[PDB]
């Protein structure tokens, strides 16, 4: 039993990692249960309770969940290649750390668009935690739900192509949640 | 395999200490085990690095000393961040990130008093920063607090007397790391340079 308390921010990355773990169990045929309780007394990050509590963030505690749940997104199920990726994910964390995403959306997209010119995935040649983290950060700009944001997919074709790929890969794990989906629409309201 | 860490003006004490522990762990294996894959990590001084570390694998990545030590502990199995039950391990990993966030973008000199008051209290009831054994949290905070409790800088001699629990814990971590850091010379030299 692990309890994750969230407030204004919903842990999309942690929820997605947990959903992937659940579908891995349903297809492999003791199990660890992670609960996502909404607490009004948390401001912008997540507090995680182990059954003591700690304060973390969605971008960072998802690394812990991948370790625990063996979802094969951050910890691979050679080591030097694994360690190299872990530093690459840290590069993406530092790239958006304490940056206003909306204010710096253009410089962010310019780097991602050029990065995806000859790259299918953000890291290596397979889906990683880096792809999913940036996917939710770019979701409000490239999902096409907000009509005002349709200029980003047309101008940045590589991001739009990559965005469609990650969306399709996550379809079997996130499209049925109806709680992750609910928080996605609220975040774009 | 080969890994090169390029540093500028900041010496990666945490990464150096982790690597030194790994080397002394190898020296205890080969000594008694005689019937039956070593990694070499280089600490190259580059003038064109400002405050972080550049790590090259032999493509390169950009990291920091406080964060890349987690990667080194994973690779070298030094038993400081990844324990070689799992939920308890995960709980510690979040605690180390709390210490990282506690000093993230904070001026250590300006907030030295509130930082020390926070650290002393935890230590009043606890021997180590995390759990009851030496962890990566202890070593990371040890080097951040080193210039204030080592007693080399005469103006900073007030801190050991005012915060005894930190001073107690600092003495312990220094003794535990003595077999791995006191013989380096290269690190000791950078300790003296940093503290002038
Ligand atoms: Tb509580
Ligand atoms: Tb805490
Ligand atoms: Tb594979
Ligand atoms: Tb390679
Ligand atoms: Tb393992
Ligand atoms: Tb006070
Ligand atoms: Tb000894």
UniProtKB/TrEMBL annotation, chain A:
<comment type="similarity">
    <text>Belongs to the class-I aminoacyl-tRNA synthetase family. Glutamate--tRNA ligase type 2 subfamily.</text>
</comment>
<protein>
    <recommendedName>
        <fullName>glutamate--tRNA ligase</fullName>
    </recommendedName>
</protein>
